[PDB]
Nucleic acid binder design. Structure first.
Ligand code: AKG
Ligand code: MN
Length: 201
DNA sequence: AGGTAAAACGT
DNA sequence: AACGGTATTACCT
């Protein structure tokens, strides 16, 4: 195990990946990738979009799961069936058979892009896991503990890898180190990540 | 009283 | 470049 309640399913999504990427492109044709601006005024290096009922976003006052894309003023695209099916299968393999996600944050990393150590914090009256799917170029994933200075595990995540955490590890600090440039036959020059959560009801 | 920003420069 | 300061506060509910 990666941690209590956490596991990495290596290449779990490899067979599903071509279809997942087609569906990323479809989602992004409606809610485009955008680099969000933090409350403090800095533009994130990762470009993001969302699908499902709820999408993660920043704005002046903090972070928010929102049912509407603040850029388009339309609902986020519905969660693709390919995404939902893959998520369900991975969650079940990881020991979370009852997971019902309603939120998928899609990350796009260009060379140099990073995601500094953070926690995916608890949502009110909800304790569902996180399912996190890697596509395209490889990245170094940091996975720590409850405190920022708890020692980090560093794990290369390659195309098709799925990481799941929850329960005792649900609030662990994690992140991505600056992406190395490279080639991948399906994504060409980037890495995508899918982050599934239950954020509503 | 407690949660959230920093999911973002210096050594 | 891996580690850690910063929020050691300010501003909300
Ligand atoms: O890209 C990854 O593997 C992790 C992404 C992540 O932590 C997030 O979007 O919250
Ligand atoms: Mn995260």
């Amino acid at each position: 195990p990666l941690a209590a309640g956490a596991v990495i399913l290596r290449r779990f999504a490899f067979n599903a990946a071509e279809q997942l990427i087609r569906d990323i492109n479809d989602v992004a044709s409606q809610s485009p990738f955008r680099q969000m601006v933090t409350p403090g005024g800095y533009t994130m290096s990762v470009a993001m979009t969302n699908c499902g009922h709820l999408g993660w976003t920043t704005h002046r006052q903090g972070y928010l799961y929102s049912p509407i894309d603040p850029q388009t003023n339309k609902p986020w695209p519905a969660m693709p069936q390919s995404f939902h099916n893959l998520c369900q299968r991975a969650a079940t393999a990881a020991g979370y058979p009852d997971f019902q996600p309603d939120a998928c944050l899609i990350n796009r990393y260009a060379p140099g892009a990073k995601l500094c150590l953070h926690q995916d914090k608890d949502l009110p009256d909800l304790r569902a896991p996180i399912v996190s799917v890697s596509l395209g170029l490889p990245a170094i994933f940091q996975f720590g503990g409850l405190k920022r200075n708890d020692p980090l595990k560093r794990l290369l995540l390659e195309h098709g890898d799925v990481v799941v955490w929850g329960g005792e590890s649900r609030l662990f600090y994690h992140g991505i180190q600056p992406l190395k440039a490279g080639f991948h036959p399906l994504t060409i020059d980037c890495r995508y990540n899918l982050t599934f959560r239950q954020a509503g009801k």
